[PDB]
Amino acid sequence: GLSDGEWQLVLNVWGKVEADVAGHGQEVLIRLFKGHPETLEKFDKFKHLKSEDEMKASEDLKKVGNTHLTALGGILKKKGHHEAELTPLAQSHATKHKIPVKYLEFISEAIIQVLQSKHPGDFGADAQGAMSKALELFRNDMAAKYKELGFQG
Ligand code: HEM
């Protein structure tokens, strides 16, 4: 539960991401992998990338980052009513990609780190608090979906 005002700050900063999704998606995956390298292992496509420069050159990394932020923007615009976009996500990440719920926490933080690095004037104390509650709400619903499918990592 976010107030309408909070959803509004969230969608306003999200507008910055939509003017460049692939660029923000790439920076988010490089941050996640620089901050939690163990997350790099779930991506078979990227197991062989050895440096930030190889990651920056990868066009597959850019497309996967693009896909991740385009699927996240779609869930945020639902403003809490994303049960339906959430289910297939929870089914594939739980059962096929095998993403433990703590990694959802690692990507939430890389997202906030890239918004803070890229848009400091627009990502003030309030947009920051609205944005972390929104990613937290999303994390929590996903874990709830993970525990009903019989998983939870
Ligand atoms: C921000 C939360 C996330 C969103 C919205 C998201 C969304 C997606 C989407 C839409 C896809 C493509 C279709 C599908 O397989 O379901 C995908 C693929 C994938 N996701 Fe995520 N995901 C998220 C978090 C994560 C995390 C934290 C990891 C690993 C640490 C991850 C690993 C993967 C992998 C390995 C794939 C397959 C990529 C490929 O084609 O190689 N996802 N994700």
PDB file of C-alpha atoms and ligand atoms in Angstrom:
ATOM      1  CA  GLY A   1       0.000   0.000   0.000  1.00  0.00           C
ATOM      2  CA  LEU A   2       1.276   3.292  -1.414  1.00  0.00           C
ATOM      3  CA  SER A   3      -0.806   6.479  -1.367  1.00  0.00           C
ATOM      4  CA  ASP A   4      -1.993   7.912  -4.696  1.00  0.00           C
ATOM      5  CA  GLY A   5       0.618  10.614  -4.228  1.00  0.00           C
ATOM      6  CA  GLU A   6       3.299   7.913  -3.864  1.00  0.00           C
ATOM      7  CA  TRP A   7       2.173   6.089  -7.028  1.00  0.00           C
ATOM      8  CA  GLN A   8       2.365   9.471  -8.742  1.00  0.00           C
ATOM      9  CA  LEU A   9       6.062  10.073  -7.765  1.00  0.00           C
ATOM     10  CA  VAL A  10       6.833   6.452  -8.831  1.00  0.00           C
ATOM     11  CA  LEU A  11       5.234   6.924 -12.271  1.00  0.00           C
ATOM     12  CA  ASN A  12       6.814  10.326 -12.658  1.00  0.00           C
ATOM     13  CA  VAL A  13      10.417   8.901 -12.178  1.00  0.00           C
ATOM     14  CA  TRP A  14       9.473   5.846 -14.290  1.00  0.00           C
ATOM     15  CA  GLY A  15       8.838   8.360 -17.144  1.00  0.00           C
ATOM     16  CA  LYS A  16      12.659   9.046 -17.076  1.00  0.00           C
ATOM     17  CA  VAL A  17      13.315   5.334 -17.528  1.00  0.00           C
ATOM     18  CA  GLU A  18      10.809   5.066 -20.454  1.00  0.00           C
ATOM     19  CA  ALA A  19      12.761   7.757 -22.519  1.00  0.00           C
ATOM     20  CA  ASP A  20      15.626   5.182 -22.537  1.00  0.00           C
ATOM     21  CA  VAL A  21      14.613   1.669 -21.316  1.00  0.00           C
ATOM     22  CA  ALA A  22      17.518  -0.342 -22.870  1.00  0.00           C
ATOM     23  CA  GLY A  23      20.162   2.064 -21.525  1.00  0.00           C
ATOM     24  CA  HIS A  24      18.731   1.960 -17.998  1.00  0.00           C
ATOM     25  CA  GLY A  25      18.229  -1.886 -18.363  1.00  0.00           C
ATOM     26  CA  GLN A  26      21.900  -2.342 -19.264  1.00  0.00           C
ATOM     27  CA  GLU A  27      23.136  -0.146 -16.433  1.00  0.00           C
ATOM     28  CA  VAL A  28      20.802  -2.063 -14.001  1.00  0.00           C
ATOM     29  CA  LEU A  29      22.189  -5.501 -15.009  1.00  0.00           C
ATOM     30  CA  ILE A  30      25.872  -4.284 -14.907  1.00  0.00           C
ATOM     31  CA  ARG A  31      25.211  -2.860 -11.364  1.00  0.00           C
ATOM     32  CA  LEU A  32      23.541  -6.059 -10.219  1.00  0.00           C
ATOM     33  CA  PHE A  33      26.383  -8.151 -11.545  1.00  0.00           C
ATOM     34  CA  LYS A  34      29.076  -5.832 -10.160  1.00  0.00           C
ATOM     35  CA  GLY A  35      27.332  -5.749  -6.773  1.00  0.00           C
ATOM     36  CA  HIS A  36      26.269  -9.541  -6.558  1.00  0.00           C
ATOM     37  CA  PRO A  37      28.343 -11.561  -9.021  1.00  0.00           C
ATOM     38  CA  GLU A  38      26.708 -14.701  -7.920  1.00  0.00           C
ATOM     39  CA  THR A  39      23.628 -13.400  -9.738  1.00  0.00           C
ATOM     40  CA  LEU A  40      25.620 -13.553 -12.985  1.00  0.00           C
ATOM     41  CA  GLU A  41      25.542 -17.343 -12.818  1.00  0.00           C
ATOM     42  CA  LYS A  42      21.803 -17.619 -13.428  1.00  0.00           C
ATOM     43  CA  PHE A  43      22.348 -16.178 -16.811  1.00  0.00           C
ATOM     44  CA  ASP A  44      23.739 -18.892 -19.062  1.00  0.00           C
ATOM     45  CA  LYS A  45      23.838 -16.349 -21.863  1.00  0.00           C
ATOM     46  CA  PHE A  46      26.403 -14.253 -19.866  1.00  0.00           C
ATOM     47  CA  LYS A  47      28.431 -16.777 -17.952  1.00  0.00           C
ATOM     48  CA  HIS A  48      31.446 -16.031 -20.174  1.00  0.00           C
ATOM     49  CA  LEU A  49      31.435 -12.153 -19.746  1.00  0.00           C
ATOM     50  CA  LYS A  50      34.603 -11.384 -17.768  1.00  0.00           C
ATOM     51  CA  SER A  51      34.744  -7.582 -17.454  1.00  0.00           C
ATOM     52  CA  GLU A  52      32.550  -4.484 -17.263  1.00  0.00           C
ATOM     53  CA  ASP A  53      33.727  -3.704 -20.791  1.00  0.00           C
ATOM     54  CA  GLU A  54      32.606  -7.051 -22.170  1.00  0.00           C
ATOM     55  CA  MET A  55      29.165  -6.507 -20.470  1.00  0.00           C
ATOM     56  CA  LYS A  56      28.917  -3.043 -21.960  1.00  0.00           C
ATOM     57  CA  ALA A  57      29.644  -4.522 -25.411  1.00  0.00           C
ATOM     58  CA  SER A  58      27.133  -7.332 -25.146  1.00  0.00           C
ATOM     59  CA  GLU A  59      24.043  -6.713 -27.160  1.00  0.00           C
ATOM     60  CA  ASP A  60      22.275  -9.740 -25.525  1.00  0.00           C
ATOM     61  CA  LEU A  61      22.855  -8.112 -22.103  1.00  0.00           C
ATOM     62  CA  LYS A  62      21.237  -4.960 -23.442  1.00  0.00           C
ATOM     63  CA  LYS A  63      18.236  -6.858 -24.730  1.00  0.00           C
ATOM     64  CA  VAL A  64      17.826  -8.832 -21.524  1.00  0.00           C
ATOM     65  CA  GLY A  65      18.123  -5.597 -19.490  1.00  0.00           C
ATOM     66  CA  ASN A  66      15.512  -3.967 -21.798  1.00  0.00           C
ATOM     67  CA  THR A  67      13.134  -6.939 -21.296  1.00  0.00           C
ATOM     68  CA  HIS A  68      13.478  -6.765 -17.490  1.00  0.00           C
ATOM     69  CA  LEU A  69      12.706  -3.001 -17.238  1.00  0.00           C
ATOM     70  CA  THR A  70       9.910  -3.146 -19.858  1.00  0.00           C
ATOM     71  CA  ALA A  71       8.235  -6.046 -17.761  1.00  0.00           C
ATOM     72  CA  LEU A  72       8.836  -3.994 -14.486  1.00  0.00           C
ATOM     73  CA  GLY A  73       7.313  -0.701 -15.877  1.00  0.00           C
ATOM     74  CA  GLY A  74       4.247  -2.707 -16.910  1.00  0.00           C
ATOM     75  CA  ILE A  75       3.793  -3.970 -13.280  1.00  0.00           C
ATOM     76  CA  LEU A  76       4.367  -0.481 -11.726  1.00  0.00           C
ATOM     77  CA  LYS A  77       1.693   1.181 -13.907  1.00  0.00           C
ATOM     78  CA  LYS A  78      -0.785  -1.334 -12.435  1.00  0.00           C
ATOM     79  CA  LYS A  79      -0.184   0.507  -9.164  1.00  0.00           C
ATOM     80  CA  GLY A  80      -0.486  -2.469  -6.891  1.00  0.00           C
ATOM     81  CA  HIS A  81      -3.011  -4.363  -9.084  1.00  0.00           C
ATOM     82  CA  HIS A  82      -0.463  -6.590 -10.855  1.00  0.00           C
ATOM     83  CA  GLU A  83      -1.528 -10.052  -9.666  1.00  0.00           C
ATOM     84  CA  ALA A  84      -1.940 -10.970 -13.279  1.00  0.00           C
ATOM     85  CA  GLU A  85       1.365  -9.654 -14.592  1.00  0.00           C
ATOM     86  CA  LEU A  86       2.918 -11.169 -11.528  1.00  0.00           C
ATOM     87  CA  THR A  87       1.889 -14.842 -11.955  1.00  0.00           C
ATOM     88  CA  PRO A  88       3.840 -15.801 -15.122  1.00  0.00           C
ATOM     89  CA  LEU A  89       6.907 -13.991 -13.686  1.00  0.00           C
ATOM     90  CA  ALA A  90       6.719 -15.954 -10.487  1.00  0.00           C
ATOM     91  CA  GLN A  91       6.100 -19.183 -12.463  1.00  0.00           C
ATOM     92  CA  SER A  92       9.175 -18.742 -14.799  1.00  0.00           C
ATOM     93  CA  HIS A  93      11.607 -17.347 -12.187  1.00  0.00           C
ATOM     94  CA  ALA A  94      10.672 -19.881  -9.531  1.00  0.00           C
ATOM     95  CA  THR A  95      10.617 -23.001 -11.730  1.00  0.00           C
ATOM     96  CA  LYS A  96      12.748 -22.319 -14.808  1.00  0.00           C
ATOM     97  CA  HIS A  97      15.311 -19.530 -14.057  1.00  0.00           C
ATOM     98  CA  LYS A  98      15.456 -20.585 -10.479  1.00  0.00           C
ATOM     99  CA  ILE A  99      15.718 -17.174  -8.980  1.00  0.00           C
ATOM    100  CA  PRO A 100      15.636 -17.158  -5.218  1.00  0.00           C
ATOM    101  CA  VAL A 101      13.568 -14.264  -3.709  1.00  0.00           C
ATOM    102  CA  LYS A 102      16.684 -12.518  -2.179  1.00  0.00           C
ATOM    103  CA  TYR A 103      17.932 -11.770  -5.674  1.00  0.00           C
ATOM    104  CA  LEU A 104      14.728  -9.791  -6.256  1.00  0.00           C
ATOM    105  CA  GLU A 105      16.046  -7.691  -3.468  1.00  0.00           C
ATOM    106  CA  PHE A 106      19.415  -7.383  -5.194  1.00  0.00           C
ATOM    107  CA  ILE A 107      17.872  -6.150  -8.499  1.00  0.00           C
ATOM    108  CA  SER A 108      15.541  -3.683  -6.552  1.00  0.00           C
ATOM    109  CA  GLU A 109      18.663  -2.044  -5.134  1.00  0.00           C
ATOM    110  CA  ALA A 110      20.529  -1.914  -8.485  1.00  0.00           C
ATOM    111  CA  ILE A 111      17.396  -0.212  -9.909  1.00  0.00           C
ATOM    112  CA  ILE A 112      17.424   2.475  -7.150  1.00  0.00           C
ATOM    113  CA  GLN A 113      21.188   2.826  -7.596  1.00  0.00           C
ATOM    114  CA  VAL A 114      20.893   3.523 -11.340  1.00  0.00           C
ATOM    115  CA  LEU A 115      17.916   5.937 -10.835  1.00  0.00           C
ATOM    116  CA  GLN A 116      19.964   7.766  -8.164  1.00  0.00           C
ATOM    117  CA  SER A 117      23.139   7.829 -10.392  1.00  0.00           C
ATOM    118  CA  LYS A 118      21.337   8.819 -13.553  1.00  0.00           C
ATOM    119  CA  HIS A 119      18.639  11.253 -12.309  1.00  0.00           C
ATOM    120  CA  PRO A 120      19.769  12.854  -8.986  1.00  0.00           C
ATOM    121  CA  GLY A 121      17.716  16.036  -9.447  1.00  0.00           C
ATOM    122  CA  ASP A 122      14.553  14.109 -10.102  1.00  0.00           C
ATOM    123  CA  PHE A 123      15.105  11.270  -7.588  1.00  0.00           C
ATOM    124  CA  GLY A 124      14.758  13.229  -4.367  1.00  0.00           C
ATOM    125  CA  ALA A 125      14.067  12.029  -0.799  1.00  0.00           C
ATOM    126  CA  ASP A 126      10.338  11.547  -1.694  1.00  0.00           C
ATOM    127  CA  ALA A 127      10.609   9.773  -5.081  1.00  0.00           C
ATOM    128  CA  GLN A 128      13.241   7.558  -3.349  1.00  0.00           C
ATOM    129  CA  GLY A 129      10.810   6.493  -0.541  1.00  0.00           C
ATOM    130  CA  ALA A 130       7.915   6.092  -3.028  1.00  0.00           C
ATOM    131  CA  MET A 131      10.113   3.935  -5.323  1.00  0.00           C
ATOM    132  CA  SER A 132      11.445   1.641  -2.564  1.00  0.00           C
ATOM    133  CA  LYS A 133       7.924   0.969  -1.235  1.00  0.00           C
ATOM    134  CA  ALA A 134       6.770   0.075  -4.750  1.00  0.00           C
ATOM    135  CA  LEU A 135       9.679  -2.358  -5.303  1.00  0.00           C
ATOM    136  CA  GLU A 136       9.114  -3.772  -1.822  1.00  0.00           C
ATOM    137  CA  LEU A 137       5.415  -4.273  -2.454  1.00  0.00           C
ATOM    138  CA  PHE A 138       6.436  -6.077  -5.686  1.00  0.00           C
ATOM    139  CA  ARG A 139       9.063  -8.228  -3.887  1.00  0.00           C
ATOM    140  CA  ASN A 140       6.520  -9.249  -1.241  1.00  0.00           C
ATOM    141  CA  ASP A 141       3.837 -10.256  -3.706  1.00  0.00           C
ATOM    142  CA  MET A 142       6.351 -12.291  -5.611  1.00  0.00           C
ATOM    143  CA  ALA A 143       7.570 -14.191  -2.554  1.00  0.00           C
ATOM    144  CA  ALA A 144       3.904 -14.784  -1.686  1.00  0.00           C
ATOM    145  CA  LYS A 145       3.476 -16.257  -5.187  1.00  0.00           C
ATOM    146  CA  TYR A 146       6.701 -18.283  -4.733  1.00  0.00           C
ATOM    147  CA  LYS A 147       5.424 -19.809  -1.421  1.00  0.00           C
ATOM    148  CA  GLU A 148       2.073 -20.807  -2.988  1.00  0.00           C
ATOM    149  CA  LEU A 149       3.824 -22.701  -5.948  1.00  0.00           C
ATOM    150  CA  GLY A 150       5.724 -24.587  -3.255  1.00  0.00           C
ATOM    151  CA  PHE A 151       9.093 -22.788  -3.510  1.00  0.00           C
ATOM    152  CA  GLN A 152      10.668 -20.159  -1.838  1.00  0.00           C
ATOM    153  CA  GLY A 153      14.350 -19.261  -2.055  1.00  0.00           C
TER     154      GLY A 153
HETATM  155  C1  HEM B   1      12.803  -6.876 -11.538  1.00  0.00           C
HETATM  156  C2  HEM B   1      12.314  -8.153 -11.285  1.00  0.00           C
HETATM  157  C3  HEM B   1      12.222  -8.962 -12.597  1.00  0.00           C
HETATM  158  C4  HEM B   1      11.441  -8.801 -13.673  1.00  0.00           C
HETATM  159  C5  HEM B   1      10.266  -7.782 -13.876  1.00  0.00           C
HETATM  160  C6  HEM B   1      11.842  -9.828 -14.632  1.00  0.00           C
HETATM  161  C7  HEM B   1      11.281 -10.051 -15.848  1.00  0.00           C
HETATM  162  C8  HEM B   1      11.746 -11.001 -16.735  1.00  0.00           C
HETATM  163  C9  HEM B   1      11.143 -11.248 -17.996  1.00  0.00           C
HETATM  164  C10 HEM B   1       9.854 -10.501 -18.494  1.00  0.00           C
HETATM  165  C11 HEM B   1      11.849 -12.198 -18.609  1.00  0.00           C
HETATM  166  C12 HEM B   1      11.575 -12.879 -20.004  1.00  0.00           C
HETATM  167  C13 HEM B   1      10.367 -13.858 -19.906  1.00  0.00           C
HETATM  168  C14 HEM B   1      10.371 -14.803 -18.751  1.00  0.00           C
HETATM  169  O1  HEM B   1      11.258 -15.710 -18.678  1.00  0.00           O
HETATM  170  O2  HEM B   1       9.626 -14.835 -17.703  1.00  0.00           O
HETATM  171  C15 HEM B   1      12.900 -12.588 -17.744  1.00  0.00           C
HETATM  172  C16 HEM B   1      13.858 -13.533 -18.055  1.00  0.00           C
HETATM  173  C17 HEM B   1      14.874 -13.865 -17.218  1.00  0.00           C
HETATM  174  N1  HEM B   1      15.097 -13.392 -15.921  1.00  0.00           N
HETATM  175 FE1  HEM B   1      14.008 -12.007 -14.992  1.00  0.00          FE
HETATM  176  N2  HEM B   1      12.875 -10.581 -14.068  1.00  0.00           N
HETATM  177  C18 HEM B   1      13.153 -10.039 -12.848  1.00  0.00           C
HETATM  178  C19 HEM B   1      14.142 -10.450 -11.966  1.00  0.00           C
HETATM  179  C20 HEM B   1      15.168 -11.336 -12.227  1.00  0.00           C
HETATM  180  C21 HEM B   1      16.332 -11.609 -11.441  1.00  0.00           C
HETATM  181  C22 HEM B   1      16.678 -10.962 -10.072  1.00  0.00           C
HETATM  182  C23 HEM B   1      17.047 -12.524 -12.077  1.00  0.00           C
HETATM  183  C24 HEM B   1      18.404 -13.179 -11.720  1.00  0.00           C
HETATM  184  C25 HEM B   1      19.089 -12.721 -10.675  1.00  0.00           C
HETATM  185  C26 HEM B   1      16.361 -12.847 -13.314  1.00  0.00           C
HETATM  186  C27 HEM B   1      16.794 -13.790 -14.228  1.00  0.00           C
HETATM  187  C28 HEM B   1      16.222 -13.991 -15.416  1.00  0.00           C
HETATM  188  C29 HEM B   1      16.754 -14.890 -16.427  1.00  0.00           C
HETATM  189  C30 HEM B   1      18.009 -15.776 -16.216  1.00  0.00           C
HETATM  190  C31 HEM B   1      15.937 -14.786 -17.490  1.00  0.00           C
HETATM  191  C32 HEM B   1      16.138 -15.502 -18.854  1.00  0.00           C
HETATM  192  C33 HEM B   1      16.895 -14.439 -19.693  1.00  0.00           C
HETATM  193  C34 HEM B   1      17.282 -14.965 -21.028  1.00  0.00           C
HETATM  194  O3  HEM B   1      16.606 -14.968 -22.057  1.00  0.00           O
HETATM  195  O4  HEM B   1      18.434 -15.463 -20.997  1.00  0.00           O
HETATM  196  N3  HEM B   1      15.176 -12.101 -13.392  1.00  0.00           N
HETATM  197  N4  HEM B   1      12.813 -11.855 -16.590  1.00  0.00           N
END
